[PDB]
Design a protein around this nucleic acid. Structure first.
Lengths: 129, 204, 203, 158, 106
RNA sequence: GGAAAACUUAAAAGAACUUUGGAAAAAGAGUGAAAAGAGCUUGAAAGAGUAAUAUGUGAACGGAUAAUUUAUAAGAAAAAU
RNA sequence: AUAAACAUACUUUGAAUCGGCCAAGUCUGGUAAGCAGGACUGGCGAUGCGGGAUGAACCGAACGUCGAGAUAAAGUGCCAAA
RNA sequence: AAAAUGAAGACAUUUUAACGAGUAAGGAAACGAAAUGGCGUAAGGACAACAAAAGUAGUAAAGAUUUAAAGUAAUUUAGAU
């Protein structure tokens, strides 16, 4: 069973004038200018982040697979979610070595925990190996 | 499907602006239009009134460079194209593609003189005009403002009428003989079974 | 006892915790996906609860016009309704139309005013058992690969029974030829000529 | 300084390079665009004709104030010049890349100028004395030039 | 083989002077000149069938269609409103659409 | 009155012989775990060069909606009695 | 009579502001002004949206993200939905 | 806002109803039914594999460039180089 996840807006709320100037990044900032075209919500430029875009509470922070992300660092952190394998998916942290990644991936199979980084830091065994 | 055929409008006995409004709407509906005899269209007002209107139009000209300015075409086919273009969207691909499907010619050229002609009842002068309201043909106004090919169209039209006068005379003779031969078949004794169906549904 | 959230799986010489059971006492359980129930099979003559109500114009023996699907524009003769599916059982007599016995939903047909006078039609078969028998099914999932020829083969075996059941057509074919011009009407495709507007058409 | 691209087959390619060459970048950038893709023998002949002003180098991007010439017809560029110094600098690189190919053992007649790239280099500054006690800059515009010569063969993939 | 459809012209989207709503498309069916002849076509199937020149190495179909239904009339001149699975592309304005005879009610 | 300027590597092992060139250098070769090659840890942005892709009538960029192309991406169970 | 318990009464502490401008079935000085100054109210400032082609103030109506419908001002030859 | 439930579930509980424009300006932290809710930078004190080797790391840190995912957003997460 997996509920239908509804995203009210899949675009990005890019900062005003970020498309014209390289010094202005794309991370959102509220236009506070007295004469600003966007904060006055003129026609055409009337797109600001509001709480009305908030996604449903039931499916908020839900991965496309229907589970939730649980960052793990070693084999013991898998035991924290072994009782909720239908709710949480493992996610090995970016700094975990390739050797420890094998133990986390191997143990998660035993405890039936889905891992979303199951193909990360694989050894040279792709071509002719 | 696809509309590969051309709608040929005989602009004789029609009003310039009412023809343009209907065509400009259908050009946006994907139809292909040819308006033959775009010089026989009628406009309201006497020649003196129309010439004054032309003079006002001729005044609009870029002061610093007349070659950039408005171009005032005198050919009646270009008079209609100006009218139709004003009723189509401006400066977008939709309005350029619509205008690519329209043509007037001052007469009936070689392919369009043997095509089926259509009429716009909304644009007919006999419907939208008081009979005593004086009108002007686009050709007569065109000559008064400098259209040099008025008598070329008259010569070409005179030949076209005399060629169609004998084509219609010859075709009438064939149709009269065919209609008689159809009457002998309908009244024939052996065709009773087929004719009975025709009469029962009002086709005979 | 095993907690309801615990389903142990065999470890292939991997390192396991102290609490996890060993492989010598772990039995693999098949993954279970299907949890609903298939539709129950009832008596052949009883109608399904999901029986579509037919239009008043569609009566046995009426000549229909198929306006959608593979045989669009063809004309068929309506026999009866498939009480197990709600679809119409129509024979566009194969000697005339080339349309065999089939099932078509009533929303893809137009009922005409013509009639064929279905009688002694011998409909002993022609039910849900017959249409399921002649259905060309797919090649399953694990049953080898059986490429190319598999679809061709079924048509060969199903042909001898499909042809046989056309004994239904023997009555309707004879009755079609009785009415003049009806035979030509049935074979030809139905078309909208110039000037026929569907909102003004009475069939 | 590294190369912009590596040859597909190092066994059938030759390389030459110059760094901080004392020649104008804008002139050499147009000369390299003219000889890119032609055979090594033709590229050596074209650069020799530029020297004596018999074939033109079309200044396609840097054409501000450049005059029109009669040899700029058919190139989709109304402007061109005959940069002698950049032609001579490329000629010395084209030669060096051929004895590198000869040492490897490649047929010189089958080589082509597959990849040639010009890059900017650090400028050297000088003094220009202006009116009212000002001093401005008199900066050189050197460049790096890379060159890869690869053999040519027909390509087919069924 | 036969004609079982009526050409309807994609007039445009349901719009105002300066806004436009691509959820509803306005079609002009051939032969329907008044809103009183519209009730027949309410609920019928409509397909925008278009041709795409695919490559030989591609398995995409050469002929694609977008299906929809006629839902309501639009004005007193036989123009109808249609809703499609995916909104029609505004590059298809003035193109012809197929109005079928199903879901049949005859 | 009054600045700017830190970093190769564990170790100089700082290329060393040949061909081209007037030379500077380049190409091979070689040292090194790795060119990290002395303008030497990483190497951003502005600015350029190359390669691949795409578009084009007096600005350019942005947004909503579709279409085309590309990419990502959803499965091994299983019917009635 | 009607309405009013997320009613009513407040207490303390504190911000910003006191250049304003517009409309009119209003007034004064002026020949008059897109002039100067006022009485009452609604606005703009601080405000986007639909309409008046364009417009700070006019008309309709005030705004979380959306779907379907009936509408307001105002419109229904084409541009432009009717 | 009002009812209901309430030692820990969890998504800052459950239900019902009303409401949501905004310059200047205000709403510090803590307060189980929370007297607004949060993101980011750096440093300090703790905590971080509970059975005596207890967060990650030469089986590749920080940083850089892009690709995807989560979040209304501030931003975060992961892959590849």
């Amino acid at each position: 069973i997996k509920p239908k996840i509804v995203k009210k807006y899949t675009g990005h709320f890019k900062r005003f004038d970020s498309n014209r100037f390289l010094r202005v990044k794309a991370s959102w900032r509220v236009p506070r200018g007295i004469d600003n075209r966007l904060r006055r919500k003129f026609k055409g430029t009337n797109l600001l982040p509001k709480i009305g875009y908030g996604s449903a509470k039931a499916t908020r922070n839900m991965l496309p697979c229907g589970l939730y992300k649980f960052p793990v660092r070693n084999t013991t952190d898998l035991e924290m979610i072994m009782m909720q394998n239908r709710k949480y998916a493992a996610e090995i942290s970016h700094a975990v070595s390739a050797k420890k990644r094998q133990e986390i991936i191997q143990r998660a199979k035993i405890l039936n925990i889905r891992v979303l980084n199951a193909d990360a830091r694989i050894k040279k065994q792709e071509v002719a190996q | 499907s696809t509309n590969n055929k051309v709608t040929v409008i005989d602009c004789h006995g029609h009003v310039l602006g009412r023809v343009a409004s209907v065509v400009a709407k259908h050009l946006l509906l994907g139809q292909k239009f040819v308006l033959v005899r775009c010089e026989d269209l009628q406009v309201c007002g006497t020649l003196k009134m129309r010439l004054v209107q032309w003079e006002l139009y001729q005044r609009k000209r870029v002061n610093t460079n007349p070659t950039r300015g408005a171009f005032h075409h005198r050919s009646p086919a270009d008079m209609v194209r100006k009218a139709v273009r004003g009723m189509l969207p401006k400066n977008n691909y939709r309005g350029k593609l619509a205008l690519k499907n329209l043509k007037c010619f001052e007469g009936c050229p070689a392919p369009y003189d043997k095509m089926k002609k259509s009429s716009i009842p909304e644009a007919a002068a006999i419907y939208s005009f008081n009979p005593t309201r004086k009108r002007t043909l686009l050709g007569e106004l065109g000559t008064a403002v400098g259209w040099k090919y008025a008598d070329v169209v008259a010569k070409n039209e005179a030949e076209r009428k005399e060629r169609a006068a004998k084509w219609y005379a010859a075709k009438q003779l064939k149709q009269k003989a065919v209609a008689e031969a159809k009457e002998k078949i309908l009244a024939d004794e052996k065709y009773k079974a087929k004719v009975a169906i025709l009469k029962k549904f009002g086709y005979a | 006892s095993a907690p309801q959230w615990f389903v142990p799986v065999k470890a292939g010489d991997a390192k396991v915790p102290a609490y996890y059971p060993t492989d010598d006492m772990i039995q693999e359980q098949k993954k279970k996906l299907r949890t609903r129930k298939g539709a129950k099979i009832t008596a052949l003559d009883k109608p399904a609860w999901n029986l579509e109500k037919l239009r008043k114009s569609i009566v046995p023996g009426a000549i229909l016009i198929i306006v959608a699907g593979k045989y669009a524009g063809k004309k068929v003769v309506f026999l009866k309704q498939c009480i197990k599916s709600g679809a119409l059982i129509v024979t566009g007599p194969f000697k005339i139309n080339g349309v065999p016995l089939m099932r078509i939903n009533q929303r893809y047909v137009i009922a005409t005013s013509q009639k064929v006078d279905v009688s002694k039609v011998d409909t002993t078969g022609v039910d849900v058992k017959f249409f399921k028998k002649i259905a060309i099914k797919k090649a399953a999932f694990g049953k080898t690969v059986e490429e190319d020829f598999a679809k061709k083969q079924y048509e060969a075996k199903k042909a001898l029974i499909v042809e046989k059941q056309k004994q239904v057509d023997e009555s309707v074919v004879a009755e079609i030829k009785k009415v003049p011009y009806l035979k030509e009407y049935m074979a030809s495709y139905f078309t909208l000529k110039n000037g026929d507007h569907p909102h003004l058409l009475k069939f | 300084v590294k190369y912009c691209a590596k040859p597909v087959n190092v066994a059938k390619a030759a390389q030459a390079r110059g760094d901080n060459l004392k020649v104008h970048f804008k002139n050499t950038y147009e000369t390299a665009d003219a000889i890119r893709g032609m055979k090594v023998a033709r590229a050596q002949e074209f650069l020799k004709n530029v020297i004596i002003k018999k074939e033109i180098v079309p200044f396609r991007k840097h054409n501000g104030g450049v005059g029109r010439k009669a040899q700029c017809k058919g190139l989709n560029c109304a402007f061109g010049r005959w940069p002698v110094k950049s032609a001579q600098f490329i000629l010395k690189l084209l030669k060096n890349a051929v004895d590198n190919a000869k040492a490897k053992g490649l047929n010189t007649a089958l080589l082509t100028v597959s990849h040639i790239a010009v890059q900017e280099a650090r400028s050297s500054r000088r003094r220009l004395y202006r009116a009212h006690g000002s001093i401005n800059s008199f900066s050189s515009s050197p460049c790096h030039i890379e060159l890869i010569l690869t053999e040519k063969e027909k390509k087919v993939a069924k | 083989k036969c004609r079982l459809h009526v050409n309807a012209v994609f007039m445009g989207f349901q719009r105002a002077q300066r806004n436009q709503y691509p959820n509803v498309a306005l079609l002009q069916i051939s032969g329907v000149n008044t809103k009183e002849d519209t009730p027949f076509y309410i609920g019928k199937r409509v397909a925008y069938v278009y041709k795409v020149n695919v490559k030989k190495g591609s398995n995409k179909p050469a002929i694609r269609a977008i299906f929809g239904k006629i839902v309501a009339p639009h004005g007193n001149h036989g123009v109808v409103k249609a809703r499609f699975l995916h909104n029609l592309p505004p590059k298809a304005m003035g193109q012809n659409l197929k109005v079928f005879l199903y879901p049949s009610n005859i």
